[PDB]
Structure 1
Amino acid sequence: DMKSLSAAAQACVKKMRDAKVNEACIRTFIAQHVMVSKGETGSIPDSAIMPVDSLDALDSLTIECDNAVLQSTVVLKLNGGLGTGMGLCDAKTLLEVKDGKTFLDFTALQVQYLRQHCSEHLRFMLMDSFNTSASTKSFLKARYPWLYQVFDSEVELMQNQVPKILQDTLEPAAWAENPAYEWAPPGLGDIYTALYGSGKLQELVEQGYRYMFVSNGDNLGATIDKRVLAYMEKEKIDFLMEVCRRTESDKKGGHLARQTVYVKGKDGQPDAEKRVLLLRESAQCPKADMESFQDINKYSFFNTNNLWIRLPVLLETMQEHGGTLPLPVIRNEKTVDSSNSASPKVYQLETAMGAAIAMFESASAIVVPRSRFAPVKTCADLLALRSDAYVVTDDFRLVLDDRCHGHPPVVDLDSAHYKMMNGFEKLVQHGVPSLVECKRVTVKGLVQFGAGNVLTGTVTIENTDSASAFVIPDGAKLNDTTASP
């Protein structure tokens, strides 16, 4: 808290103040710092948690909220990330997904739709990083002028940065070579801090906003559902997390868990127990416990990052904690320069947005279909979306064509040539093949689609000479075949 801080901590405070990091962020970080200095490692072992047996599901819900609720609703999209995994040096949300629209186009259109059809007061917010801000703003200025006019004052929330601290001392790392490396984002849990520190949460609450839907900017599936709001009104939920069933491909990703608090009586005469939901990511899991962490039957619920928050409760909670949300610290072990392994060893302190599930008395989780968690991880994914296996709804949502029957075309793309965006674009330079009526397409080696290519059933296009490009001709219809030169 007040100093009454250690020298290491004060040095952190000093560096942040000089930099001039937001005070809420300083308060939040320092509280983490103190924990770490008292021995907190952030580890969550299997002994400390129980699995969650069952949860309500979205599919049970039919009732839609009315317009008046939406009027009190804020959409916040996390827009910090770069497109780096796909070779894209820009905000990930600015990647073109379908029909020449970005993720951000779809979100902005969805919002406009809600504003047009339900509620002009529904608010839209972006959480940007320093890396993404200018580009996002320029994109709006061109394409969404209404957002642009309010960008600095209403839309944009800035992510904080926090100092890396040396492992032995907890004092700020120094890297004369590159001073930026001294800093890191804090990461996703920082949203609460940013919202509080900026004064935005207070502003939102005072204007009468009641709900926030928070989601990844890169999740196409994350769209406002009116059922969820009605459910929140009805059940009086303060924090709601959407989860999907954890599949094998998610076994290395964050799961739901529970703990219990037994409150002995305590002059009521009744011994009470409360369930507490929490999130556990792999960085919190001891090696000994990892195989269990990876048991998808046992921990079957995966956090989507679609979160619904009752804003006044969040504010009141932050206020009751010295203007913070005291999320559990994740204390990563790193080197100040990650790539250089002789750099000083550091702790990078982060929190998870999802981890807020533990902070509220009225928190729950709801099982949602996988369609609500639809990121683009690979150019193979992008291929499927750009294809006619997907259609755009009246309200600007992306959904599978009916003919798919809930099954996407499976796309296998050679990572020698298509891992990155420049490579991918080249493959589709003369058009995107029709994949709707296609179960699987595999592309091996260097290929270019023709215009008007239609793939049916299972198709492989293989070119085995890497000094060549195999070009499919216009009109090609390939059904249940392998094509090759």
Structure 2
Amino acid sequence: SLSAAAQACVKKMRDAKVNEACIRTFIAQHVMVSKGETGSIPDSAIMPVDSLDALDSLTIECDNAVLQSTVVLKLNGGLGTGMGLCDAKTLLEVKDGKTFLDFTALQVQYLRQHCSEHLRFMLMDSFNTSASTKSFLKARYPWLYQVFDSEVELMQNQVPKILQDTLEPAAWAENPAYEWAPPGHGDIYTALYGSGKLQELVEQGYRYMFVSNGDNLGATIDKRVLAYMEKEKIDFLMEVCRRTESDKKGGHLARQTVYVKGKDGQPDAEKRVLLLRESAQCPKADMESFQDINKYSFFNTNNLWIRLPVLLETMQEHGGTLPLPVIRNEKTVDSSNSASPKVYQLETAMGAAIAMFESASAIVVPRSRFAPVKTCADLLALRSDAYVVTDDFRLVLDDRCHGHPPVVDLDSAHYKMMNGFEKLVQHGVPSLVECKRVTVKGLVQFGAGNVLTGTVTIENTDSASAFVIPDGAKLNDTTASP
């Protein structure tokens, strides 16, 4: 009953022993692409979301019992490539010798000893981060290592990249691994169901799952969110932030009205759902509208809260799968060769799931809960005294920051990657708790005991090479140069 091209995919995935849940999900996607699915979402098909509740307005915490049925999961499939690293992103040092992973593991341990010893902690890995993650925990957190396979790791699937002209499994004899690729974080739902872990957590009594990027340290367990969901009876909750001028490029939250047929089960219906729209899915005709941060003022933080039982049920009603809108990524089999066969890489975003539930909601949260470390510049801020560690092992701004983190702007071609960045801070990390903005242009090196206040710019004339700042140097509202 499949197009043969879809049959080749199935065959290929079964030969490599790809679980069936993944195959099903991927095939439905293949079918949609086969029908010429655009993914397009014109402004005329959505409406803005004018108001949502706020995490700052909330005050009630859930009792420790709710946490006993909670699972904390961190996306950990990423490498520090964009930062000149090939190890797991979460294994990057963030503060005083601690990595992202250390902090989440410690936050978890803290909740297990003071609130709920049954709080579950999971990591979504890929073939690229698994080994390194395992040996890290083995050395630093034996209690998680002992149960690494049984309850910590969730292995992300890998699907076949397909040729654009025929939609059949691409081939690259040079490097067969290039024929496969991850299917986006949306695959989290597939992996959970397919691996048998969803069914297992639900039957064990787990009710809530909080998912967030491993590199987003501001994404911690907030008891107010669980209470709010228990009270409003929410099955899926997306944390969102107000879009600023810098976000007018990123996706946003939107409203949509649907009418579903439904034959022999439930009569027709007209529902109002919530969805996400990326730039990709936006037609240049409405691209201007897409950037009007005053119309669409909210963006997905990727901090999601899902009611596991409901997730299982819905996936079951859909034939053991979750029909998320497919994203058709255009690439070449070998990224490193513009002449390699053009292909489509099918993926989904986990935030798209917000449209899959009747009791879905979004809540506005402060920017502090969306603190991804994407560049070494973001790492500098974190390493500095601008951020302190709480007793329950959370990373928050120091009080003298007033909720405003130092704006750090490091010159690429020098600090775009750990390679050069560690040089810059080789002799020490300057104090930035009182610094509004720091910009580094050209090859520079902080001294030691350096203290920056106000706005500071450090630029190297014309690359005389190596501009080492004096030690104890107190730069205030200045432009240091040689």
Give the alignment's TM-score, normalised by structure 2.
0.96
Q: 1:448 to 1:162 in 2, by over 3 A?
A: same
| Kept in 2: contact 1:160–1:190 (CA 8 A) | yes
Q: CA deviation at 1:180?
A: 1.6
Q: CA deviation at 1:272?
A: 6.8
Q: CA deviation at 1:335?
A: 2.2
User: Residue by residue, what CA displacement relative to the aligned partner does 1:252-279 show, whole Å, maximum 9, x if unpaired?
Assistant: 2121111113579999999974210011
| Kept in 2: contact 1:444–1:464 (CA 8 A) | no
Q: 1:154 to 1:283 in 2, by over 3 A?
A: same
User: Residue by residue, what CA displacement relative to the aligned partner does 1:264-323 show, whole Å, maximum 9, x if unpaired?
Assistant: 999999997421001111222223332222221111110010000000000011111111
Equivalent-residue separation in structure 2 for 1:9 and 1:451 (angstroms): 61
Q: 1:55 to 1:208 in 2, by over 3 A?
A: same
SS of equivalent residue, structure 1 residue 355: helix
Q: CA deviation at 1:465?
A: 4.2
| Kept in 2: contact 1:164–1:347 (CA 8 A) | yes
Of residues 313, 318, 330, the one that matches 1:316 is 313
Q: CA deviation at 1:229?
A: 0.1
Equivalent-residue separation in structure 2 for 1:48 and 1:55 (angstroms): 21
Equivalent-residue separation in structure 2 for 1:179 and 1:135 (angstroms): 23
Equivalent-residue separation in structure 1 for 2:346 and 2:330 (angstroms): 9
Q: CA deviation at 1:449?
A: 1.6
Equivalent-residue separation in structure 2 for 1:88 and 1:426 (angstroms): 15
Q: 1:268 to 1:68 in 2, by over 3 A?
A: closer
User: Residue by residue, what CA displacement relative to the aligned partner does 1:163-213 show, whole Å, maximum 9, x if unpaired?
Assistant: 111222221111222212211111111000000011000110010000000
Q: Which moved more, 1:224-233 or 1:48-57?
A: 48-57
Q: CA deviation at 1:447?
A: 2.0
Q: Which moved more, 1:339-348 or 1:56-65?
A: 339-348
For 1:12-411, what aligned pairs fall within 5 Å after superposition?
12-262=9-259, 273-411=270-408
Q: CA deviation at 1:461?
A: 2.3
Equivalent-residue separation in structure 2 for 1:139 and 1:261 (angstroms): 47
| Kept in 2: contact 1:239–1:307 (CA 8 A) | yes
Q: Which moved more, 1:28-37 or 1:445-454?
A: 445-454
Residue 433 in structure 1 maps to residue 430 in structure 2: yes
SS of equivalent residue, structure 1 residue 356: helix
SS of equivalent residue, structure 1 residue 125: strand
Q: Which moved more, 1:291-300 or 1:311-320?
A: 291-300
SS of equivalent residue, structure 1 residue 90: coil
User: Residue by residue, what CA displacement relative to the aligned partner does 1:427-477 show, whole Å, maximum 9, x if unpaired?
Assistant: 111111111112222222222222211122222222224242122232222
Residue in 2 that maps onto 1:461: 458
Give the alignment's TM-score, normalised by structure 1.
0.95
Equivalent-residue separation in structure 1 for 2:284 and 2:165 (angstroms): 22
Equivalent-residue separation in structure 2 for 1:345 and 1:109 (angstroms): 44
Equivalent-residue separation in structure 2 for 1:152 and 1:265 (angstroms): 41
Q: 1:404 to 1:37 in 2, by over 3 A?
A: same
Equivalent-residue separation in structure 1 for 2:260 and 2:315 (angstroms): 24
Equivalent-residue separation in structure 2 for 1:271 and 1:148 (angstroms): 50
| Kept in 2: contact 1:213–1:308 (CA 8 A) | yes
Return structure 1 stretches of 4+ with deviation > 6 angstroms: 263-272
User: Residue by residue, what CA displacement relative to the aligned partner does 1:101-144 show, whole Å, maximum 9, x if unpaired?
Assistant: 11111111111111111000000000001001111111111111
Equivalent-residue separation in structure 2 for 1:358 and 1:432 (angstroms): 44
SS of equivalent residue, structure 1 residue 258: strand
| Kept in 2: contact 1:409–1:441 (CA 8 A) | yes
Q: Which moved more, 1:224-233 or 1:337-346?
A: 337-346
Equivalent-residue separation in structure 2 for 1:472 and 1:22 (angstroms): 56
Q: Which runs of 5+ in 2 are unaligned?
A: none
Q: CA deviation at 1:154?
A: 0.8
Identity of aligned residues (%): 100
User: Residue by residue, what CA displacement relative to the aligned partner does 1:346-383 show, whole Å, maximum 9, x if unpaired?
Assistant: 22111110000011111011111111100112211111
| Kept in 2: contact 1:283–1:332 (CA 8 A) | no
Q: Which moved more, 1:337-346 or 1:442-451?
A: 337-346
SS of equivalent residue, structure 2 residue 183: coil
User: Residue by residue, what CA displacement relative to the aligned partner does 1:53-95 show, whole Å, maximum 9, x if unpaired?
Assistant: 2111111211000000000000010000111111121111111
Q: 1:312 to 1:371 in 2, by over 3 A?
A: same
Q: Count how many residue pairs are aligned between Structure 1 and Structure 2.
A: 482
Q: 1:405 to 1:132 in 2, by over 3 A?
A: same
For the aligned residue pairs, the C-alpha RMSD in angstroms reads: 2.1
User: Residue by residue, what CA displacement relative to the aligned partner does 1:32-68 show, whole Å, maximum 9, x if unpaired?
Assistant: 1112222322222222211112111111211000000
Equivalent-residue separation in structure 2 for 1:229 and 1:400 (angstroms): 24
Q: 1:288 to 1:446 in 2, by over 3 A?
A: same
Equivalent-residue separation in structure 2 for 1:360 and 1:154 (angstroms): 26
Equivalent-residue separation in structure 2 for 1:139 and 1:325 (angstroms): 33
Equivalent-residue separation in structure 1 for 2:464 and 2:66 (angstroms): 59
Q: Which moved more, 1:472-481 or 1:417-426?
A: 472-481
Q: Which runs of 5+ in 1 are unaligned?
A: none
Equivalent-residue separation in structure 2 for 1:356 and 1:421 (angstroms): 35
User: Residue by residue, what CA displacement relative to the aligned partner does 1:14-49 show, whole Å, maximum 9, x if unpaired?
Assistant: 000111111110011011111222232222222221
Q: 1:332 to 1:481 in 2, by over 3 A?
A: closer
Q: Which moved more, 1:366-375 or 1:177-186?
A: 177-186
Q: Which moved more, 1:379-388 or 1:205-214?
A: 379-388
| Kept in 2: contact 1:260–1:274 (CA 8 A) | yes
Q: 1:268 to 1:23 in 2, by over 3 A?
A: closer
